[PDB]
Each structure stands twice: as structure tokens, then as C-alpha cells.
Amino acid sequence: KQQEEEAERLRRIQEEMEKERKRREEDEQRRRKEEEERRMKLEMEAKRKQEEEERKKREDDEKRIQAE
Numbered sequence: 001k002q003q004e005e006e007a008e009r010l011r012r013i014q015e016e017m018e019k020e021r022k023r024r025e026e027d028e029q030r031r032r033k034e035e036e037e038r039r040m041k042l043e044m045e046a047k048r049k050q051e052e053e054e055r056k057k058r059e060d061d062e063k064r065i066q067a068e
Contacts, residue, residue, distance in 0.1 A: 062068070
């Protein structure tokens with residue numbers, strides 16, 4: 001048991017923690033990206049829904065053109 005030996009042990013522990021911290025950061029970034037992608041998909045669906053509503057309105061206007 002020596003102070004120098006302890007320091008070496010302490011150094012290894014610090015390195016392991018850094019790797020874990022990096023992994024967490026990477027995971028967080030992935031989660032953020034995933035959330036962004038999901039939001040984009042939701043927005044895209046909304047746009048389609050809006051487009052569909054407009055199409056129905058346009059169709060209705062045409063029908064009353066001559067009573068088809």
C-alpha cells in the first residue's frame with residue numbers, strides 16, 4: 001500500500017468515469033435527434049391532413065358547379 005499506487009488506481013477510475021460521461025452525452029444527443037425526427041413526422045402528418053381538408057372543400061365547390 002503506497003500513495004503512488006493509490007494515485008494510479010485513482011487515475012484509472014477517473015478515466016472510466018469520463019468514458020461513461022461521453023456515452024451518456026452520445027445517448028442524449030441521439031434522443032434529442034429522435035425527438036426532432038418524431039416532431040418532423042408529426043408536422044408532416046398535419047400538413048397532409050390540412051391538404052386533405054382543402055381537397056374536400058375544392059371537390060364540394062365543383063359539385064355545386066352544375067349539380068353533379
